Structure 1
Amino acid sequence: SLIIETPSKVILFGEHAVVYGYRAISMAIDLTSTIEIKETQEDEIILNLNDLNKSLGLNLNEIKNINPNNFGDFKYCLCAIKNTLDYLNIEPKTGFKINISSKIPISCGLGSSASITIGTIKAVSGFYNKELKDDEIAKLGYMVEKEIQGKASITDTSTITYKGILEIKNNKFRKIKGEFEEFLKNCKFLIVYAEKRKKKTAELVNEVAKIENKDEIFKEIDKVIDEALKIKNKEDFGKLMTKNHELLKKLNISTPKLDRIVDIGNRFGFGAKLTGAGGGGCVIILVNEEKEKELLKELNKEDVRIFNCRMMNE
């Protein structure tokens, strides 16, 4: 009868370059999913999507043999349950129910699925009073993604499992502490769901791949991280966010709707930039407490969803 509240995730810099051996600066954020699990004693497992008011019942002996992509919206949580079980080498004797509710917008690079996954792993393990190291959990999440999508990157799962700010390169991460982590504990950001993403993330990767100037852009993108890593004030940091945005714009994966949002961000805030693959999605804005009230009014005058969020630590 525990309740797991799993963090969300956002890329501060590195969006598409990471894919080419460059670095990604990922940060865990307040937007959480909440998964509650409780034994039932009916002889089956029940999954319930509150936000979508959907429900599913399965027998304890179908669990390990079901195929995730046969269950639409329940697939990630479902898959997280199956893997945690055989990983713990446990065979469900008794039943239980899981209630799922996330606040995190879907398909816009915030790690909506991974949050559900990481919270299901922690839930099922704890329900059996067997705990896993962040190391085991991160991998179980990564495998759930790989199993469902065919492939996966550690970014979402590692970021959401280890919390804080991570540096992603190739396929390994580097935790970031010091002044940079300190400075971020001091920043209030805003995730603005400008528009929906009518395109698939791989589809955008291909559109970035089909660019000549791409590499020279990635290099400028990496020099921005060099500088970002060493920045001290939100004024300087904001602009660096805006600059990375101007670069992503050179990969024409940005949109007129995102640019508008970014504008409001540079003017009424400290700077702004889209996050994740382009073609719609969210724009992350570093809040300027000074004009914060302003920022809102202007942003609110738009067909968008906004979310107050700060970094998430351990």
Structure 2
Amino acid sequence: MLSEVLLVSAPGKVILHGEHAVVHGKVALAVALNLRTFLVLRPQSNGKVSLNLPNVGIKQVWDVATLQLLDTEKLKKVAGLPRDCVGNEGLSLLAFLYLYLAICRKQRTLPSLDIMVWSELPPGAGLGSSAAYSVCVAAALLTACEEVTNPLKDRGSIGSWPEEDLKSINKWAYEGERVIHGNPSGVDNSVSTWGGALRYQQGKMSSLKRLPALQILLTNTKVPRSTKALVAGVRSRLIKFPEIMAPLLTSIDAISLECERVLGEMAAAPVPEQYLVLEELMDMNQHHLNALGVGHASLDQLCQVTAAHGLHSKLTGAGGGGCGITLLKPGLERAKVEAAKQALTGCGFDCWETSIGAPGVSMHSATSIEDPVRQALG
């Protein structure tokens, strides 16, 4: 057990290319979104572990005494420890407990902690915020129970864990996603742990070696959608017009592959003509997705406003609403981008200017933390 206060942060994700094509065997590219989730863990004296989730406005307190006397599927039983009430986010408090016991069990006394979680990620918008949360939790606990090295052992500003350690973090982050999702693939938590870019084919994942600096505008239309529905309609259209749909899917597959090739050649020396290829790829993937049938008026609107300012975008994820991405290459005029944001907001959409291909699980010194975050954390 450590004593110092731990501060860890993990990024969310966006599907650059591949969205619906992956369901049919095609390649997809998932990348770390720099909209992070922070978790501050404070050691305590009182025999109580308190998990505090501001966002979802819920706080829960357990007393080590009771949990320490609990006999250590498994889920049903776990629910009999805290309770069983309302909350789609109630599974999270269940995912915390699981991660808490299973990881600290090898301790001769369950520690008394205080966890503070606050992210910049909009929940449910498909940016994998629950994995970012699981990763943060598994990372803080693992470090507190010294099951993993302490990145800031040398009192650095910002730090990360070594490969062997990141693997332990992911494995545990995954169990936590299993409890809340049931059958998660592992892309979300893998993206949150290793950061950077991920390649997903048919159950197999890899980590693109090197990525360039990519600036984007993340837009949330707040339009609610049914992921189960979209995927069904696509499969439906795949059955109705097979000779039309089959090729289309292959076309999207080629877009992921092409992007993979370019990003790699950009990691060398980013020539301006490389951003031109990327936006052409986005333009085409957006049209293909509209063809698949997962488009939405709020999304055509997002692209229309954006193109009006010379920017290129594409939906990201399930389509039919949700978020969209817009590329910001090196050289645009502060004015073009600034107006797009205003326009986007006027439509009633949330808009963030962030980055893609983000760092990954990180430990921060309380002085590396910005002000807005520090205010929400302490």
TM-score in terms of structure 1 length: 0.89
Moved more, 137-146 or 216-225: 137-146
Which of the numbers 229, 238, 251 marks the counterpart of 1:220?
251
How many Å apart are 1:69 and its aligned residue? 7.3
Mapped to 1, the partners of 2:215 and 2:31 lie a distance apart of 13
Selected match of 2:111 from 94, 116, 122? 94
Deviates most, 216-225 or 57-66 = 57-66
Are 1:34 and 2:61 counterparts? no
RMSD: 2.3
Residue in structure 1 matched with residue 196 of structure 2 by the alignment: 164
Pair 1:255 & 2:296 matched: yes
Residues 96, 176 of structure 2: 8 Å contact kept: yes
Query: Is the 8 Å Cα contact of residues 103 and 141 (structure 2) preserved in structure 1?
Result: no
Give aligned pairs, total: 308
**1:104 matches 2:131:** no
Change (3 A) 1:209 1:88: farther
How does 1:203-242 map onto structure 2 within 5 Å? 203-212=229-238, 213-231=244-262, 233-242=274-283
Query: Is 1:238–1:266's contact at 8 Å kept on the other side of the alignment?
Result: no
Structure 1 range deviating more: 258-267 or 75-84 = 75-84
Which residue of the partner structure matches residue 295 of structure 1?
Answer: 337
Q: Percent identity?
A: 24
User: Residues of 1 paired with 2:110 and 2:315: CA distance?
Assistant: 47
Rounded Cα–Cα distance in structure 2 between residues aligned with 1:162 and 1:69: 34
Aligned twin of 2:57? 53
Once residues 160 and 188 of structure 1 are traced to their aligned partners in structure 2, the CA distance between those partners, rounded to angstroms, is 18
Partners of 1:58 and 1:150 lie apart in 2 by 25
Alignment of 1:122-137 (within 5 A): 122-131=139-148, 133-137=165-169
Residues 262-277 of structure 1: matches in 2 within 5 Å?
262-277=303-318
In structure 1, C-alpha distance between the alignment counterparts of 2:20 and 2:93, rounded to whole Å: 27
Which structure 2 segments of 5+ residues have no match? 149-163, 239-243, 267-273, 361-378
**Corresponding residue number in structure 1 for 2:369:** none
SS of 1:198's partner is coil
Residue 20 (structure 1) aligned with residue 32 (structure 2)? no
Which of the residues 125, 133, 140 maps onto 1:116?
133
Specify every segment of 5 or more residues in structure 1 that has no aligned partner in the other structure, as ranges: none
**Large movers: runs of 4+ above 6 Å:** none
Larger Rg: 2
CA distance in 1, matches of 2:333, 2:281: 19
Distance in structure 2 (CA, Å) of the matches to 1:123 and 1:78: 17
Query: Deviation of residue 246 (structure 1)?
Result: 1.0
Select 2:98's aligned residue among 77, 82, 85. 82
Aligned residue in 2 for 1:191:
218
| Aligned partner of residue 79 in structure 1, secondary structure | helix
Query: Does 2:333 match 1:307?
Result: no
Whole-angstrom CA distance in 1 between matches of 2:235 and 2:55: 36
* TM-superposed deviation, 1:270: 4.3
264 and 69 in structure 1: CA distance in 2 versus 1, 3 angstrom threshold: farther
Q: Which amino acid aligns with 2:141?
A: V
Match for residue 202 of structure 1 among 217, 228, 241: 228
Q: Distance in 2 between matches of 1:305 and 1:52?
A: 18
The TM-score normalised by the length of structure 2 is: 0.75
| Structure 1 residues 62-89: Cα deviation after superposition (integer angstroms, max 9, x where no partner) | 4875339757325335414423641564
| Structure 2 residue identity aligned to 1:50 | P
C-alpha contact 2:98 2:176 (8 A) present in aligned 1 = no
Superposed CA offset, 1:162-191 (max 9, x none): 11011111122111124xx1xx32x21110
Higher relative contact order, structure no. (Cα contacts within 8 Å, ≥ 6 residues apart): 2
